[PDB]
Design a protein around this ligand. Structure first.
Ligand code: ATP
Ligand code: ATP
Ligand code: ADP
Ligand code: MG
Ligand code: MG
Lengths: 186, 171, 177
């Protein structure tokens, strides 16, 4: 095998080329790569910072999905999946129109409330198809641990980021459609 | 020297200078790449980031102190008059903080937006510090490496006399 | 070494020393970057900061104390007579003594303000806390030392700020429990 540091450094730089890395993020990556070379191959600190390198590069920096800004097409997706729910569908269509006039993608905070079994959790997947956004679901019912969202500090053995960060790595775009289910039961 | 060239641009207290001076002494011997070799730079950078002796002129006037209020907000004649009373007594007293000001009223009436207008009135640096839940070590107490929000407030405003608004104290 | 020096002037009871001595050994065997090391450091800092055997120098002269009370407030002869009697009792005893007193009356009359005048007449240290509609017993006695980010009780916090074991403690709204 070749030099581990050179292969590790070069492969991590390959992932950063496609992304739009913020300046402060790029400085953090650069400084930790400097200490990666000086550390030993089998050292524990080397493995701790290697995972830190992998997580940072895995985050989609300045990457957004190609949303479907077509009112005619968005309606067709919504009606085929579900019946009725005009108030939800009209709000979604108006959200699409605003994004067109603004000329750029935008994020909104929406909450659907009502009796059980009316289609709240099932319309969320349909909305993602209409908006061409990748869909992620996470329920907060009976949730008592804060580290699920914010993760654990890198110093802890086996520490991992929060699943919101794991959401971005799996979604691979900075514009997901995260469904926070059962907010009233936190 | 880059840290020192920033340090010499502003007045540094002697008590803090000795603490700052010893931090450079340790950092030179460190390899700058470790858990403790990086916190010293973080400790030192946060020190030099804090302003000392740098301030914005306060209480510019009373004629155009009002003029900021009318073009920023409508109505609130009694509230606006009360602020000018607080500004007038502050100038005579010669002290910035005389007593704590609080505003209570129906939600969404404009109390939060007043503070931004107030900062522009007497040339302060606005900073909102709202709390939703009460937790001891969460917002002021910090850690140890997470510096307290008050310390972070001065760094981002680059002044010794900013304006900090505490919002929703009851909740 | 620094914390041992800061206990030199205080008159520490024996049960205080053994707790301090045993925590010093625990602090010695710990590590600098340990979470419980900070807890041990925080706990040991509070113990030494609390004054032990330190009493503020009282004022035991009726003439000057009466003059001080008259200038601060108008009327309140019933309160003033009790305070003058309080000082005279301390002279016969030869040592400082404490009492529990209650001031009840209409709001805004001067119940809170007179106590501040009392502290200056007696050369004591003034500390105030309110119990209007108390809900948590943790205010008086703090939280347990094992809890993360725990703090001592407000009374214990009073000795730290007053730096004496003979302060004047004020309680507000005992009729609004
Ligand atoms: N308008 C509708 N058209 C078609 N299917 C529907 C409609 N409303 C609900 N459904 C279907 O009925 C079921 C309702 O489950 P769903 O999770 O959507 O309900 P919910 O409102 O989230 O309930 P809960 O509050 O208990 O979570 C799903 O199969 C959903 O697809
Ligand atoms: N008198 C006014 N003149 C101009 N704009 C106003 C006025 N009152 C309210 N507004 C507008 O309404 C907005 C809502 O007010 P604001 O957010 O300050 O309310 P608040 O009292 O801080 O709310 P909360 O109770 O939620 O903390 C303001 O940001 C401002 O844009
Ligand atoms: N006899 C007095 N002499 C001087 N000041 C007084 C007198 N009575 C009341 N005051 C003033 O009025 C205020 C009364 O408020 P306070 O006594 O704190 O309210 P409360 O009686 O509800 O505790 C004090 O600030 C005090 O300065
Ligand atoms: Mg559901
Ligand atoms: Mg507000």
């Amino acid at each position: 095998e070749k030099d581990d540091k050179d292969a590790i450094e070069e492969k991590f730089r390959e992932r950063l080329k496609e992304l739009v890395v913020p300046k402060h993020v790029m400085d953090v990556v650069d400084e930790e790569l400097s200490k990666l070379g000086l550390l030993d191959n089998h050292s524990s600190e080397f493995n701790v910072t290697r995972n830190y390198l992998d997580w940072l590069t895995s985050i989609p920096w300045g990457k957004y999905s190609n949303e479907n800004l077509d009112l005619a097409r968005a309606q067709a997706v919504l009606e085929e999946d579900h019946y009725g729910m005009e108030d939800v569908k009209k709000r979604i269509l108006e959200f699409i129109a605003v994004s067109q006039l603004r000329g750029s993608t935008q994020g909104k905070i929406l909450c659907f409330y009502g009796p059980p079994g009316v289609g709240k959790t099932s319309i969320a997947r349909s909305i993602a198809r209409a908006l061409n956004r990748e869909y992620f679901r996470f329920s907060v019912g009976g949730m008592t641990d804060v580290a699920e969202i914010k993760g654990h500090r890198r110093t802890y053995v086996g520490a991992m980021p929060g699943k919101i960060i794991q959401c971005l790595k799996k979604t691979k775009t900075e514009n997901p459609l995260i469904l926070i289910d059962e907010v009233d039961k936190i």
